Amino acid sequence: AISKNLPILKNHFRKHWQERVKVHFDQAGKKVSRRNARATRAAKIAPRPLDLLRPVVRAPTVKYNRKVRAGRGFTLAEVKAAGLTAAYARTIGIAVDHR
Amino acid sequence: AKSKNHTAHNQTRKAHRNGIKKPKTYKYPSLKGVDPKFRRNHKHALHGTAKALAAAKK
Amino acid sequence: GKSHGYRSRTRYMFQRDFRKHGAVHLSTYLKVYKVGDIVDIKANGSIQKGMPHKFYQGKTGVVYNVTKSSVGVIINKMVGNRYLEKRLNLRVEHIKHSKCRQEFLERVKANAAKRAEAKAQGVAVQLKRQPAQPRESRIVSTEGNVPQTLAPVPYETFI
Amino acid sequence: VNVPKTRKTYCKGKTCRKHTQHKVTQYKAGKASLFAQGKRRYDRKQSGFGGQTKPVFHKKAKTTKKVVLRLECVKCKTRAQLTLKRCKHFELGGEKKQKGQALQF
RNA sequence: GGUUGCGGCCAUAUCUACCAGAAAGCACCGUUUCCCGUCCGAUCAACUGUAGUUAAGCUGGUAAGAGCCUGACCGAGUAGUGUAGUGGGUGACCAUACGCGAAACUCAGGUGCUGCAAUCU
RNA sequence: GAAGACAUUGUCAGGUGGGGAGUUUGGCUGGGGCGGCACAUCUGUUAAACGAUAACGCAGAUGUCCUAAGGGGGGCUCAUGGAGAACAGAAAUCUCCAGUAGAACAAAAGGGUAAAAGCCCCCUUGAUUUUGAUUUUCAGUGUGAAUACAAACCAUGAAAGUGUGGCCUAUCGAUCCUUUAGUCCCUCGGAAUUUGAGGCUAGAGGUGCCAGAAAAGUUACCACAGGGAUAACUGGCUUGUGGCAGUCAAGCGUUCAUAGCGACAUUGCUUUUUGAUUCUUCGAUGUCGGCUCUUCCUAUCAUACCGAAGCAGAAUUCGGUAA
RNA sequence: UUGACAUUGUGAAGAGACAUAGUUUC
RNA sequence: GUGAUUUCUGCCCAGUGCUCUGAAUGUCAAAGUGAAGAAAUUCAACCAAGCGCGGGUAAACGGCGGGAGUAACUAUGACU
RNA sequence: GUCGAAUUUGGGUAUAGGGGCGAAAGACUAAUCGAACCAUCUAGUAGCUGGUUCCUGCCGAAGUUUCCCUCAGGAUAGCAGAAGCUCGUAUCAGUUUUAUGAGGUAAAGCGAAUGAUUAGAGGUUCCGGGGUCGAAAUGACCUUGACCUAUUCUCAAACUUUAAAUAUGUAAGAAGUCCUUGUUACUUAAUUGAACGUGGACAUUUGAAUGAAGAGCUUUUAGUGGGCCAUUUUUGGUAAGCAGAACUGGCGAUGCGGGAUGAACCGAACGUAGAGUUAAGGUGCCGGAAUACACGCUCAUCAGACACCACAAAAGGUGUUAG
RNA sequence: CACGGACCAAGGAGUCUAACGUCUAUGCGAGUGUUUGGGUGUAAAACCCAUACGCGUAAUGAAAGUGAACGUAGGUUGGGGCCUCGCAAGAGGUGCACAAUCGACCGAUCCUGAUGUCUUCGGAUGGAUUUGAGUAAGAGCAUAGCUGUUGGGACCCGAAAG
Ligand SMILES: C/C(=C\[C@H](C)C(=O)C[C@H](O)CC1CC(=O)NC(=O)C1)[C@@H]1OC(=O)/C=C/CC/C=C\C=C\[C@@H]1C
Ligand SMILES: [Mg+2]
Ligand SMILES: [Mg+2]
Ligand SMILES: [Mg+2]
Ligand SMILES: [Mg+2]
Ligand SMILES: [Mg+2]
Ligand SMILES: [Mg+2]
Ligand SMILES: [Mg+2]
Ligand SMILES: [Mg+2]
Ligand SMILES: [Mg+2]
Ligand SMILES: [Mg+2]
Ligand SMILES: [Mg+2]
Ligand SMILES: [Mg+2]
Ligand SMILES: [Mg+2]
Ligand SMILES: [Mg+2]
Ligand SMILES: [Mg+2]
Ligand SMILES: [Mg+2]
Ligand SMILES: [Mg+2]
Ligand SMILES: [Mg+2]
Ligand SMILES: [Mg+2]
Ligand SMILES: [Mg+2]
Ligand SMILES: [Mg+2]
Ligand SMILES: [Mg+2]
Ligand SMILES: [Mg+2]
Ligand SMILES: [Mg+2]
Ligand SMILES: [Mg+2]
Ligand SMILES: [Mg+2]
Ligand SMILES: [Mg+2]
Ligand SMILES: [Mg+2]
Ligand SMILES: [Mg+2]
Ligand SMILES: [Mg+2]
Ligand SMILES: [Mg+2]
Ligand SMILES: [Mg+2]
Ligand SMILES: [Mg+2]
Ligand SMILES: [Mg+2]
Ligand SMILES: [Mg+2]
Ligand SMILES: [Mg+2]
Ligand SMILES: [Mg+2]
Ligand SMILES: [Mg+2]
Ligand SMILES: [Mg+2]
Ligand SMILES: [Mg+2]
Ligand SMILES: [Mg+2]
Ligand SMILES: [Mg+2]
Ligand SMILES: [Mg+2]
Ligand SMILES: [Mg+2]
Ligand SMILES: [Mg+2]
Ligand SMILES: [Mg+2]
Ligand SMILES: [Mg+2]
Ligand SMILES: [Mg+2]
Ligand SMILES: [Mg+2]
Ligand SMILES: [Mg+2]
Ligand SMILES: [Mg+2]
Ligand SMILES: [Mg+2]
Ligand SMILES: [Mg+2]
Ligand SMILES: [Mg+2]
Ligand SMILES: [Mg+2]
Ligand SMILES: [Mg+2]
Ligand SMILES: [Mg+2]
Ligand SMILES: [Mg+2]
Ligand SMILES: [Mg+2]
Ligand SMILES: [Mg+2]
Ligand SMILES: [Mg+2]
Ligand SMILES: [Mg+2]
Ligand SMILES: [Mg+2]
Ligand SMILES: [Mg+2]
Ligand SMILES: [Mg+2]
Ligand SMILES: [Mg+2]
Ligand SMILES: [Mg+2]
Ligand SMILES: [Mg+2]
Ligand SMILES: [Mg+2]
Ligand SMILES: [Mg+2]
Ligand SMILES: [Mg+2]
Ligand SMILES: [Mg+2]
Ligand SMILES: [Mg+2]
Ligand SMILES: [Mg+2]
Ligand SMILES: [Mg+2]
Ligand SMILES: [Mg+2]
Ligand SMILES: [Mg+2]
Ligand SMILES: [Mg+2]
Ligand SMILES: [Mg+2]
Ligand SMILES: [Mg+2]
Ligand SMILES: [Mg+2]
Ligand SMILES: [Mg+2]
Ligand SMILES: [Mg+2]
Ligand SMILES: [Mg+2]
Ligand SMILES: [Mg+2]
Ligand SMILES: [Mg+2]
Ligand SMILES: [Mg+2]
Ligand SMILES: [Mg+2]
Ligand SMILES: [Mg+2]
Ligand SMILES: [Mg+2]
Ligand SMILES: [Mg+2]
Ligand SMILES: [Mg+2]
Ligand SMILES: [Mg+2]
Ligand SMILES: [Mg+2]
Ligand SMILES: [Mg+2]
Ligand SMILES: [Mg+2]
Ligand SMILES: [Mg+2]
Ligand SMILES: [Mg+2]
Ligand SMILES: [Mg+2]
Ligand SMILES: [Mg+2]
Ligand SMILES: [Mg+2]
Ligand SMILES: [Mg+2]
Ligand SMILES: [Mg+2]
Ligand SMILES: [Mg+2]
Ligand SMILES: [Mg+2]
Ligand SMILES: [Mg+2]
Ligand SMILES: [Mg+2]
Ligand SMILES: [Mg+2]
Ligand SMILES: [Mg+2]
Ligand SMILES: [Mg+2]
Ligand SMILES: [Mg+2]
Ligand SMILES: [Mg+2]
Ligand SMILES: [Mg+2]
Ligand SMILES: [Mg+2]
Ligand SMILES: [Mg+2]
Ligand SMILES: [Mg+2]
Ligand SMILES: [Mg+2]
Ligand SMILES: [Mg+2]
Ligand SMILES: [Mg+2]
Ligand SMILES: [Mg+2]
Ligand SMILES: [Mg+2]
Ligand SMILES: [Mg+2]
Ligand SMILES: [Mg+2]
Ligand SMILES: [Mg+2]
Ligand SMILES: [Mg+2]
Ligand SMILES: [Mg+2]
Ligand SMILES: [Mg+2]
Ligand SMILES: [Mg+2]
Ligand SMILES: [Mg+2]
Ligand SMILES: [Mg+2]
Ligand SMILES: [Mg+2]
Ligand SMILES: [Mg+2]
């Protein structure tokens, strides 16, 4: 089982792998579904937008810290400085992150 | 269960199909394994005469 | 079982030549080798350092290196269906200048001459070698030499 | 074989870097610590159930060992190893061979 | 031409027995203070070149000499061998065809050639 | 009533544990097994005058031994023999002559070697340091062993030089892991110091089935995949052995080789002996003996007819035609 | 099977140490 | 285990086993003890059963010699 | 066989698979037992055995190398296909010639070394032993030994001075030859050398033959890795249709003509066909083709009749032939 | 005188997938790859797209680390093609790819150790029979096919067993 000048390969197919094959045949269906979900939520959600104001934030580690990127939520200090409390901020479509 | 042990039978037939290729020959062969002390000097000698030619093309 | 050491099978090869044992004569050391020279290879059994392996006995190669007590010789050896280049470190005792070349060098140096001798004169040279030609006609005389007639001779025993 | 207990030979420490007198002695293995990673990987491997987990050589053939000389430069302190052909009797103590003497009594 | 010092090829130079060798050289040879080495100044070391000698070394010549070297249609185109046949022969083997080709033997001839340098009736 | 912080039980630790579990239990091979090693090697031969080349071919050898038996230098000449000298003899120690090596050089054998490569003495550690190239085995991989240089440091010798172990051709070992030497060099990943650990370079600890598993038997209670690549049985080649028959004629036979026989030799034949082989058959061609029954061969035991005789007769022996 | 630890508490006498007051351990 | 009755059931405990009011300063685990160390850790002492030592045991498993010589022919060998 | 009990036997009930039950056979446990039956893990693994589905065209093998718990298997190299690619009188060669090496086989040799071996002859002993004379003798004489000298018959895979044939290394030019004189840290006493150069001079008879459906080069991949046969060389074996090597040629993989038949011998290698001519082998008839020509020999109451090949020997004949 | 096969129909054996080598075709090219996802739709199609990511554009060390021009990006020899002269044969010029050879450049290893210094940090410079899957005016990325490779029931059918 070793011959010729070929690279050494590492195909992990030594378990009953054919029992865990997920073929995404439902790629189109899901997309549609996901689209309908959004159309639906938009409608239920009256005039509100589908999403929350997310904060800017500088990304972690030497590799990405050059870039700036959406964060989770705003921080009690930020919210305070922009002249609001977080309980209210939360109801006015803004994301708030105590962490 | 014994079997043949050895024979050259048919081996020169095989070597002659593609042929016994003659050694192949180069002008300027490798200095592989030539006296290092020589080569060290030859290296500066050559450098020297190159200079003296590029010079003669000033 | 079998045996195949280095100097295996070499009893008579490296043996010394009848009434020629002992010191090698000094001319063997006064000879001089330059890269490019053509040498024949033959082992002096009394000189164990720097010996050719027996495969290279009788073989002729070209010098590629000159060293304190030796010359490096390149021999082309055929293995399988191909030649590979081989490099030999041989002491000067196991080598001599091949004359496989003199007939050439002597012939070149001569070929230049009769070419000059022609040109200068007014050509008509012809200086490639030629094979033995068949014999021309000839007339053999009988004078002093009438043909002797022989016949086959009878069976006889002596013993 | 008997070898001298001293040896003028090459010492390759930055400040010696020349032939110096060495004291000669014979290398002895050295105790094995637990906590070498090997012994550590081995002890874990061998715990629990499942018996011996690693081969154990039996098919021994050699009846000698190559002797090794520890060589210590009396100047620069530094040491060199030097390993000897297989022999069966080794000493470095004295008793030199002797000229042409009678066999005793 | 001789001779010596250094040599190349390493018996045509070696071996055995005789004899001849001028001149120079070389040699044998005298000595034991000194360096030096020995059981022993025999070797080895030094000193003299004086006191002595061609006896030996050395060189050359002799010999139906031993050896060695060279040559020949001397043996022999023999032995052996590459290639050929639906050749012979129970076989063992052997002839033939196209080629290559010995060794011993026999006889004849020979017995160092020569480089560098110094020296010599 | 007993018993009593001991028994018991829980968890680790040592012993014991074919009652039980799982597994293993070499190879080449004139079948296999016992043996031997042709399994890693060396010398000579086989080997067919380059190289290569096989068999459980032939004669041997290797798992060591050496601080000198390594290195350098000087001196010297060995085996043997002859002729000589008190005790002294075949052999003691002293001398001279001859001596091409007839000796010696760890070891097998072959090669090599004479102001040496042998013997005696003097000085020594080059058997050292660094890292490449090369030759054999070859895949032009590895390992062993070896060659010639480079860059050091030394040994020896007045010096040229020689010396990188043993005059040459054999004398040996991956990955993992341990251990040591090296520089004081890298890392221990939040930062440091120090222990510890881990890396890098080079060695040792060993695999001899020697390119390198960790390994006991039994099965006739047996099982599977195969094999006519392989034994036992018919048959085929062979015919040593077995059996049978000749040639020569020294002898035997009172005398007389051959009436009948026949030594030393030597030519054969046979295929109801036994071996040797391994072609066919292991997805079957059912052993030995006997019984029954046919047919065939002749190297004829009897029966017909003969030739010989050491055939008087009777009896017998040899031979021919004869199955 | 054998040891240690845990289940494990209370007295008394005797040994055992800070090194001939009793905390502690057999 | 042996295998009705009758009769008998010998010698051997060195080995393998089994077994014991034996001995003990040889070996020997975890815990606990001590020493060193900044600690990780290293070293030491003590130390259970067992092992080793000593005893028992065959209707336990089993075992139960070899070489020379020697009596008035030879042979044989009570005897050595 | 036993038949009044260790008897036979219904039903109920218990024991369940490394389990039971066993007056013990590895017995029996639902036709299943040296480990039941059912399902699943499971399409268990298989270096082993079997099979593997259309046509035509072109090319076309191996049974060898090395390593492997390797010997019915792999990996590696070789042999094969495919794709091409860079170039082209170019370079190429299972050949010869010429010149120059290497080699220790055949033969030869042994009055040459080593080792074997038959015979005498002449020598030599203060010295190997007997014996005559003796008081002995290092006395004399015989005697037989060894040794020596010159001779003599015979031998060697592991002997050899000599030494083939076949086979074998290299060379036969432009990458050549000559003149001038630059570079360096190497090397020389030395601008000496060494190596690499600049500039200059000579073209296809430019440096033998023959051939060349061109030459070079790269990648990748199949099958194979049981081989067997013949001439010659050749080992073991009495031998073998036996076992093992060498070089070539074949068979295997291949039909066709011949050898009646037959893997391998002889001839000859294959597209579909016509005419012609041949090979090897044949031409009385079978059967295409002279019962052709010519000189001899042979007569067998078991004639002989064509290589491989399907067998015959010593010996003997007053058969006949020629010498 | 080895095995299978009495006969006939029908079924009946190199597949698909993950990741790959070589070759080839195609797109784009120092880049390349729209399809996780978003947008959109005549709705699993076709059409469109932002940020990342992957491979490539740098190597070498065990590592800390350092990191590719002396020069027309070098010399020499061969080199198709082109250019110049010539009527032609030829001569010279230039010479990409490719080949051979000698150098230079980057990393590792070893040596050298300048100007300097929180006197032990710093490591310039010039070197060496050492060494790398490197540089030296980029060749890749993607899709697709035949052949080949490994894992998978793995061309199809087959154990004794566990
Ligand atoms: C054989 C041993 C050392 C060897 C030099 C060696 O390299 C062995 C090697 O490590 C085996 C490894 C290799 C590997 O890559 N993987 C493995 O799993 C096995 C050891 O032996 C002894 O030293 C003495 C041994 C005497 C007998 C007693 C014990 C032997 C132990 C040692 C197995
Ligand atoms: Mg997977
Ligand atoms: Mg699996
Ligand atoms: Mg799904
Ligand atoms: Mg959202
Ligand atoms: Mg076999
Ligand atoms: Mg066979
Ligand atoms: Mg084979
Ligand atoms: Mg041999
Ligand atoms: Mg040597
Ligand atoms: Mg744990
Ligand atoms: Mg130190
Ligand atoms: Mg005079
Ligand atoms: Mg004095
Ligand atoms: Mg004197
Ligand atoms: Mg003197
Ligand atoms: Mg005189
Ligand atoms: Mg003289
Ligand atoms: Mg003479
Ligand atoms: Mg012939
Ligand atoms: Mg013939
Ligand atoms: Mg309790
Ligand atoms: Mg319990
Ligand atoms: Mg048990
Ligand atoms: Mg068991
Ligand atoms: Mg076996
Ligand atoms: Mg076997
Ligand atoms: Mg056998
Ligand atoms: Mg055996
Ligand atoms: Mg074999
Ligand atoms: Mg083997
Ligand atoms: Mg060896
Ligand atoms: Mg040969
Ligand atoms: Mg070979
Ligand atoms: Mg020897
Ligand atoms: Mg000398
Ligand atoms: Mg050493
Ligand atoms: Mg390897
Ligand atoms: Mg090696
Ligand atoms: Mg020596
Ligand atoms: Mg070995
Ligand atoms: Mg250290
Ligand atoms: Mg730390
Ligand atoms: Mg870190
Ligand atoms: Mg950390
Ligand atoms: Mg530190
Ligand atoms: Mg530390
Ligand atoms: Mg093995
Ligand atoms: Mg092996
Ligand atoms: Mg085993
Ligand atoms: Mg078993
Ligand atoms: Mg068979
Ligand atoms: Mg027979
Ligand atoms: Mg017979
Ligand atoms: Mg017989
Ligand atoms: Mg019989
Ligand atoms: Mg007779
Ligand atoms: Mg008579
Ligand atoms: Mg008589
Ligand atoms: Mg058979
Ligand atoms: Mg069968
Ligand atoms: Mg059958
Ligand atoms: Mg049957
Ligand atoms: Mg039948
Ligand atoms: Mg008859
Ligand atoms: Mg009659
Ligand atoms: Mg009579
Ligand atoms: Mg009848
Ligand atoms: Mg009949
Ligand atoms: Mg207790
Ligand atoms: Mg009992
Ligand atoms: Mg009973
Ligand atoms: Mg009872
Ligand atoms: Mg009794
Ligand atoms: Mg008693
Ligand atoms: Mg007992
Ligand atoms: Mg303890
Ligand atoms: Mg017993
Ligand atoms: Mg059980
Ligand atoms: Mg079970
Ligand atoms: Mg159970
Ligand atoms: Mg039984
Ligand atoms: Mg059933
Ligand atoms: Mg299947
Ligand atoms: Mg199955
Ligand atoms: Mg197999
Ligand atoms: Mg073809
Ligand atoms: Mg192995
Ligand atoms: Mg094989
Ligand atoms: Mg098969
Ligand atoms: Mg030979
Ligand atoms: Mg011979
Ligand atoms: Mg001969
Ligand atoms: Mg002969
Ligand atoms: Mg001869
Ligand atoms: Mg002789
Ligand atoms: Mg004669
Ligand atoms: Mg030739
Ligand atoms: Mg040739
Ligand atoms: Mg032509
Ligand atoms: Mg052409
Ligand atoms: Mg291939
Ligand atoms: Mg292949
Ligand atoms: Mg293969
Ligand atoms: Mg096979
Ligand atoms: Mg043939
Ligand atoms: Mg076949
Ligand atoms: Mg054919
Ligand atoms: Mg007919
Ligand atoms: Mg007709
Ligand atoms: Mg014939
Ligand atoms: Mg026939
Ligand atoms: Mg007649
Ligand atoms: Mg048949
Ligand atoms: Mg079959
Ligand atoms: Mg059938
Ligand atoms: Mg069908
Ligand atoms: Mg649309
Ligand atoms: Mg849809
Ligand atoms: Mg976005
Ligand atoms: Mg990096
Ligand atoms: Mg740094
Ligand atoms: Mg140049
Ligand atoms: Mg041009
Ligand atoms: Mg140019
Ligand atoms: Mg560099
Ligand atoms: Mg490195
Ligand atoms: Mg890379
Ligand atoms: Mg890369
Ligand atoms: Mg497959
Ligand atoms: Mg099954
Ligand atoms: Mg089953
Ligand atoms: Mg199992």
PDB file of C-alpha atoms (C1' of nucleotides) in Angstrom, chain A residues 17-18 21 23 25, chain I residues 43, chain J residues 14-20 145-156:
ATOM      1  CA  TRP A  17     -18.439   7.786   8.025  1.00  0.00           C
ATOM      2  CA  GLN A  18     -21.206   7.154   5.507  1.00  0.00           C
ATOM      3  CA  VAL A  21     -22.852  12.741   5.489  1.00  0.00           C
ATOM      4  CA  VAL A  23     -25.408  17.015   1.743  1.00  0.00           C
ATOM      5  CA  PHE A  25     -29.568  19.734  -0.953  1.00  0.00           C
TER       6      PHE A  25
ATOM      7  C1'   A I  43     -21.197  -6.763   2.459  1.00  0.00           C
TER       8        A I  43
ATOM      9  C1'   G J  14     -13.404  -1.476 -11.612  1.00  0.00           C
ATOM     10  C1'   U J  15     -18.424   2.011  -9.061  1.00  0.00           C
ATOM     11  C1'   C J  16     -19.419   6.599  -6.322  1.00  0.00           C
ATOM     12  C1'   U J  17     -17.239   9.862  -2.749  1.00  0.00           C
ATOM     13  C1'   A J  18     -13.014  12.677   0.229  1.00  0.00           C
ATOM     14  C1'   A J  19      -8.050  14.253  -0.727  1.00  0.00           C
ATOM     15  C1'   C J  20      -4.273  13.614  -4.420  1.00  0.00           C
ATOM     16  C1'   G J 145     -11.639  15.109 -18.527  1.00  0.00           C
ATOM     17  C1'   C J 146      -8.767  10.467 -19.282  1.00  0.00           C
ATOM     18  C1'   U J 147      -5.068   7.548 -16.509  1.00  0.00           C
ATOM     19  C1'   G J 148      -2.812   6.606 -11.711  1.00  0.00           C
ATOM     20  C1'   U J 149      -2.724   6.971  -5.713  1.00  0.00           C
ATOM     21  C1'   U J 150      -4.754   6.301  -0.393  1.00  0.00           C
ATOM     22  C1'   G J 151      -9.371   5.694   2.782  1.00  0.00           C
ATOM     23  C1'   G J 152     -14.183   3.683   2.274  1.00  0.00           C
ATOM     24  C1'   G J 153     -18.482  -3.001   1.372  1.00  0.00           C
ATOM     25  C1'   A J 154     -14.197  -0.382  -2.913  1.00  0.00           C
ATOM     26  C1'   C J 155     -14.328  -5.102  -9.466  1.00  0.00           C
ATOM     27  C1'   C J 156     -18.031  -9.422  -7.989  1.00  0.00           C
TER      28        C J 156
END
